[PDB]
Amino acid sequence: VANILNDWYIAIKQQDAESAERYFEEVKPDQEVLMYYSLLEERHKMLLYQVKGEELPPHSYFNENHKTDHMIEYYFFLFEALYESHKRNFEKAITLFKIAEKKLKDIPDCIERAEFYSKVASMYMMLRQSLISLNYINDSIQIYRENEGYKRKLATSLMIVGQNYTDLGLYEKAEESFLEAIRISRVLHDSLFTALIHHNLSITYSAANRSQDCINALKKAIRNKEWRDSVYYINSLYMFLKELYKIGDVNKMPYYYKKTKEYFKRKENKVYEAKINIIYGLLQQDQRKSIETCRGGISYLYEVNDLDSVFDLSLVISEHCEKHGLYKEALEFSKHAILAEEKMRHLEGL
């Protein structure tokens, strides 16, 4: 069983979702290994969420739990760091990461090191901690670049590099990273991964005011049937609406807005509900209603600690009000953008 479990975990470290899914089905048929199996069941679901956009289970092994092998403890803290990172409880994530980093000092696997650094780098990129994220991911990339079987991890890592570059105003270098990642996914014949990378690349084009490139990348993403069945479909639909709004192509938004309603009919996503509502609220003609919609969406994003969305959309709302001469409200959301960005840069827990 233990060898099956380590092979199952190796497939996760290679982002081999098909192997991982086969190992999980093979092992499903009362010791410390029960913790090992429960730890790997969580990690596997996080992989399927990461790579296929499959929903995360409602109940996690971590929400309601309570010494062992130095490996099982490293896994517990790393995998819980991932669980807290996705819930935007970054204070706890950073703490759980520092514990895992110490235990990793006694784990000699270079691939395990690349795995750890790549999860730490991803979290710091979420906080727009770009230089720290780059130091971590660049080490992971070297390990992956010198080892066979880690082409998916190299591609995934290049997306973290690219996003870091976009956060640093280096849009050409950011594009290069995503393009190298796309080539890898085409070599891999992984059309879902290609759609996923195009979606993320569309963020870089939008940040670079390359709106037509942004829309073209999103079109390539949503053409994939698996992408449209994933939880990430709504992210593309939102990026479409936002970019259509920026360029004034309001006539094409009803098409995509109708698609968001069909997504929300099947899946709950209050974060992107608020974000799409803000875009729609910018189209409202009644000033008073428009601003209250933006206030409701922005304030809800504060509540779930998605400060990057507050920063992003507050700039969009502020610019919108500025163009309409509503300078008091433009300032109101200009201030939200500073607050979100300063709090994002702060680590008041650690």
């Binding site: 956009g53 990129m125 996003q163 990026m239």
Partner: peptide, 6 residues
């Protein structure tokens, strides 16, 4: 906007 799949 933050990227997905990382």
């Amino acid at each position: 906007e933050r990227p997905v799949g990382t």
